[PDB]
Amino acid sequence: KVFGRCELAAAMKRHGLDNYRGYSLGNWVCAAKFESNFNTQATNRNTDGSTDYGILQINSRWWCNDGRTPGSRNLCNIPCSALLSSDITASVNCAKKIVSDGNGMNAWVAWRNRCKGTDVQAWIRGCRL
Numbered sequence: 001k002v003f004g005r006c007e008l009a010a011a012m013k014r015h016g017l018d019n020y021r022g023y024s025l026g027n028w029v030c031a032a033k034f035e036s037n038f039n040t041q042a043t044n045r046n047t048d049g050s051t052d053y054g055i056l057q058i059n060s061r062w063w064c065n066d067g068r069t070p071g072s073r074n075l076c077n078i079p080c081s082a083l084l085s086s087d088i089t090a091s092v093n094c095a096k097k098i099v100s101d102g103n104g105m106n107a108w109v110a111w112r113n114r115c116k117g118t119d120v121q122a123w124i125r126g127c128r129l
């Protein structure tokens with residue numbers, strides 16, 4: 001599924017991501033924009049053989065099981081395929097664990113490089129939320 005901006009903002013809110021770990025909703029929408037272009041089916045292979053999955057490009061190195069990342073963990077206790085669904089529940093639950101791991105949203109390199117310290121509220125501007 002390719003979400004619209006406000007559509008995704010709304011979905012994130014309903015699943016309790018807004019202000020989660022102190023990160024306002026615009027931060028999450030901005031991260032999703034640059035991670036996946038709002039496409040729940042987005043996959044990208046990493047140099048090291050891990051893969052990033054879904055709207056927030058969650059990595060198989062730590063967070064999900066894809067059967068082809070040796071030595072990896074599955075801290076969200078989910079198949080990585082779950083992170084590609086139209087329904088974002090699994091992605092949001094896993095992202096809550098990630099953002100709680102010590103690094104905050106710096107766990108998403110695209111957030112640090114393209115959202116941190118910008119007008120992130122712009123991503124939710126205009127939206128009925």
Ligand SMILES: N#C[C][C][S]([C]C(=O)[N]C(=O)O[C][C][C][C][C][C][N][C]1[C](C#N)N([O])C2=C([C]=[C][C]=[C]2)N1[O])B1234B567B89%10B%11%12%13B85%14B%1158B%12%11%15B%139%12B%1061B%12%112B5%153B%14874
Pocket residue numbers: 118119120121122
């Ligand atoms: N951090 C910080 C300083 C904010 S100062 C600006 C400030 O305090 N403005 C604030 O009190 O405005 C009240 C209205 C807030 C509306 C917030 C929604 N819009 C935002 C925003 C947010 N939230 N942002 O974070 C922005 C932004 C526009 C551009 C960059 C960041 N923007 O339009 B400002 B002054 B110096 B150079 B001058 B300009 B930039 B830098 B500092 B920054 B901006 B002024």
Ligand code: NA
Pocket residue numbers: 019020021022023
């Ligand atoms: Na909070």
Ligand code: NA
Pocket residue numbers: 060061062063064065066069072073074
């Ligand atoms: Na894994």
